[PDB]
Design a protein that fits this description.
The structure is a homodimer. By secondary structure, chain A is an alpha/beta fold. Chain A is built from 7 helices and 15 strands. In chain A, helix 1 packs parallel to helix 4 and helix 1 runs parallel beside helix 7. The first copy, chain A, is elongated, with a radius of gyration of 20 Å. Chains A and B meet through strand 3, strand 4 and strand 5 of A and strand 3, strand 4 and strand 5 of B. Bound molecules: flavin-adenine dinucleotide (2 copies).
């Protein structure tokens, strides 16, 4: 049939690929089209630090924990292939430093070799007295998106540069099903008082010698409002801010300083690092991910809509699990229409 | 007095700086000259992989077990300094993969977070059934030599490009003490059957996405006759050859393929790595490191000679603990000769 996906970030292209991948063989014309106002370099996904790591706190809707676990194994299974890196995927080991002892996270068994830090190791970070170590995966937002768009292109999925004004618009257009993957920018399509922006800023730097990631935590100031250093495919992401309710899209020198001096006390060799860029992004902060089916009708119309947005600061980390879900709900639409 | 150090590799320059730091403030005129027929870019130390790791096999002269540990505490103690990376030092984590279980190494507790690989992680390396994981350090020999030469230069230590034909030649040159740090070429100045070269070849590639080190072991081929991938400051080192008794300084086309094919089977993503260099060096293969005193009376002369060579594949790994040793034997001399 005719499927339209609004959104070209990790969640949108991920959901698309997954859908076409599992139903193209049964559906006659399966017309999948992606609409989005901004693409690749300009999505929230490219500004991502590119690390697999759910929050240190448990989620409401434990259904999100299984989605994180799914993504990990999907990505881990490519850690074999010769094209893993072209996808923006690669293994990394690192630390999560704390000022006081905290309980283990619920994902301690999802990652590789998680263990508490020994005394010697903490002497490398005098400012912290507690912490963990483990190996995870790197999913460079920028590169992963190019790969996803390429995989789709070959499958016949078409890309349109357009800012959808409302569902009806796409509906009239002729979409039988609509996949809403518009991140923090939802609301504009349908009001959602629960979906707010979580402004984050990062500095891109050239420190090829930094091979391990380091995330620090200030349990008083909130998650990611503490300096972190995350190496990527060929640049290191320096970060430290998470401001809720802030729609300011411009780099703030006020934050520039916090991140830089915060990261330079943590890793003094950064004084030689060369800044390659500074970007700002809005995490789709929502008390819970919205992933459900909704029936919107317009007289003789009756269009189908499936949502999948509001993944806060764990979009890359949970993307695939969420995608499998949508595909599953998409399967129940065909069933309801007698399509198998 | 006059101390003449023969050898400008990691063992010579280190011993040089160690002697200076400890006795400079006491001996009236402390002359220190370093002679070498080949410098930095061209020493065996510049061809090193850079990993801090002794052989898996138990040692001989448990004396080496402590020189290794000293050297590690020396290097680790630089991880907080802003000059760590400019010395060629940075932390790395990695794997040691085997085809069958083997006893733990004696240095297991010398490094950080040592542990055995689990089933999941093994599925990442299909050809191996056992392994360890631990964090260590990179001591890029290249950077380290330039770093030491600068530190020595600001200290008054003069360098001389001169090939030493005999110890006598130097004892007559006007030198009271001699530190023999001539590497695999020591025998040329005093026959030594126990010493032989351990030729090895290595491929320098550009694969910045590789963050961890991978070392495979083929128990039936000896040591480092299995591939290994060691990420460096800004280039990655491919390797896997150990040929004792071979003195060819040129690259063997076959050895190139044993390394390349083997590392690609281990790490598929290499197919897109752009080779940057290939080198060949000879490890100072000796059943035991030779660090000892040897008076050499040359008619009235009487020069003291201290030997520090034959470190095979663990020169960088054990350098500092040896220099600390030369400095003490030198203390003795200083005392007997009664300059203190
Ligand atoms: C600084 C920073 C670092 C981060 N680091 C990490 C990390 O390490 N790991 C992690 O998992 N997560 C991280 N995140 C969060 C992660 O980036 C997000 O969860 C993820 O990008 C959300 O994906 P998305 O689908 O919302 O897509 P987005 O890319 O945000 O948006 C997809 C598309 O929606 C389109 N769109 C929106 N409105 C409309 C409209 N009206 N019409 C048409 N198209 C529209 C956009 O044009 C866009 O292309 C980070 C976030 C920030 C800000
Ligand atoms: C491929 C490869 C990889 C390696 N990887 C590692 C690793 O990861 N970790 C590790 O710890 N070790 C490694 N090693 C071993 C390490 O490189 C050696 O143990 C170390 O370089 C030995 O130092 P050296 O003191 O012998 O110095 P070298 O640099 O070999 O020699 C020092 C000096 O001796 C001078 N010299 C010799 N004879 C004379 C003479 N007659 N007159 C004047 N000057 C003379 C030379 O000119 C030179 O400047 C590796 C070796 C190889 C070949």
């Amino acid at each position: 049939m005719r499927v339209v996906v609004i959104g070209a970030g990790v969640i949108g292209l991920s959901t698309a690929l997954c859908i076409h991948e599992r139903y193209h063989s049964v559906l006659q014309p399966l017309d999948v089209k992606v609409y989005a106002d901004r693409f690749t370099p300009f999505t929230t996904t490219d500004v991502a630090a590119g690390l697999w790591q759910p929050y240190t706190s448990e989620p409401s809707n434990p259904q999100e924990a299984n989605w994180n676990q799914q993504t990990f194994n999907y990505l881990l299974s490519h850690i074999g292939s010769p094209n893993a890196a072209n996808m923006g995927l690669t293994p990394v080991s690192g630390y999560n430093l704390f000022r006081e002892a905290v309980p283990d996270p619920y994902w301690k068994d999802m990652v590789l070799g998680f263990r508490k830090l020994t005394p010697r190791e903490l002497d490398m970070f005098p400012d912290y007295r507690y912490g963990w170590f483990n190996t995870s995966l790197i999913l460079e937002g920028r590169k992963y998106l190019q790969w996803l768009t390429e995989r789709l292109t070959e499958r016949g999925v078409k890309f349109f540069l357009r800012k959808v004004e409302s569902f009806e618009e796409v509906a009239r257009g002729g979409a039988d099903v609509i996949i809403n993957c518009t991140g923090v920018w939802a609301g504009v399509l349908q009001p959602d008082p629960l979906l707010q922006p979580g402004r984050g800023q990062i500095i891109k730097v050239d420190a090829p010698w930094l091979k391990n990631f380091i995330i620090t935590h200030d349990l008083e100031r909130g998650i990611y409002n503490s300096p972190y250093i995350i190496p990527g495919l060929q640049a290191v992401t320096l970060g430290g801010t998470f401001q809720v309710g802030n729609w300011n899209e411009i780099n703030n020198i006020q934050d520039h300083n916090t991140i830089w001096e915060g990261c330079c006390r943590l890793e003094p060799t950064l004084k030689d690092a060369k800044i390659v860029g500074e970007y700002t992004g809005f995490r789709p902060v929502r008390p819970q991910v919205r992933l459900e089916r909704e029936q919107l009708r317009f007289g003789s119309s009756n269009t189908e809509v499936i949502h999948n947005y509001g993944h806060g600061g764990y979009g890359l980390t949970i993307h695939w699990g969420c995608a499998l879900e949508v595909a599953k709900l998409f399967g129940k639409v065909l069933e309801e229409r007698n399509l198998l």
